[PDB]
Amino acid sequence: DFVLDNEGNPLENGGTYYILSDITAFGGIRAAPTGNERCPLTVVQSRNELDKGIGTIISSPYRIRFIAEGHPLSLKFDSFAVIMLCVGIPTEWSVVEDLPEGPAVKIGENKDAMDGWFRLERVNNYKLVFCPQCGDIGISIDHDDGTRRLVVSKNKPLVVQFQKL
């Protein structure tokens, strides 16, 4: 069926949505710098329930108007604040292979980036899944920095909702 936002309307191919958390405790998805990263290249889930995160442009290569489950997808952050040094980086979501935390979701320029598509499946909650050329996108917490990183994990998938911008 069609993926629906929290107002009961079908997701529009190319529209901008906030990816909110099922849990009333967490906020939306956004970017942050982790490790040796100077630019916010790591896709993370906000710890602040009042934080909606960055608007995400959701599109499918298919010539359809409304996004449906199983449709191959591309996720791209809308514009957000970055230091001058990071101006111009790609904001498309990518899954990067070789990494301690497992394949991780990152933005910016990546060589070790896997080829594939994201897909949505009903769980109005859904879970993100990645299919290389499919793993549930879940959360991996770094207890030192408290950061909640988006990684593909056979563990409990991250359950989300969409709010049209």
Curated annotation (Swiss-Prot):
Domain of life: Eukaryota
Listed GO MF terms: serine-type endopeptidase inhibitor activity
Alphabetically ordered keywords of this record: Disulfide bond, Protease inhibitor, Serine protease inhibitor, Signal
Function field: Inhibition of trypsin.
Protein name: Trypsin inhibitor A
Species assigned in the record: Glycine max (Soybean)
Record flagged with keyword Signal: yes
Feature type site, description Reactive bond for trypsin: 63-64
Other facts: The sequence of variant A is shown. Electrophoresis identifies three genetically distinct variants, A, B, and C, that are inherited as codominant alleles.
Keyword Disulfide bond: yes
Disulphides: 39-86, 131-134
Similarity annotation: Belongs to the protease inhibitor I3 (leguminous Kunitz-type inhibitor) family.
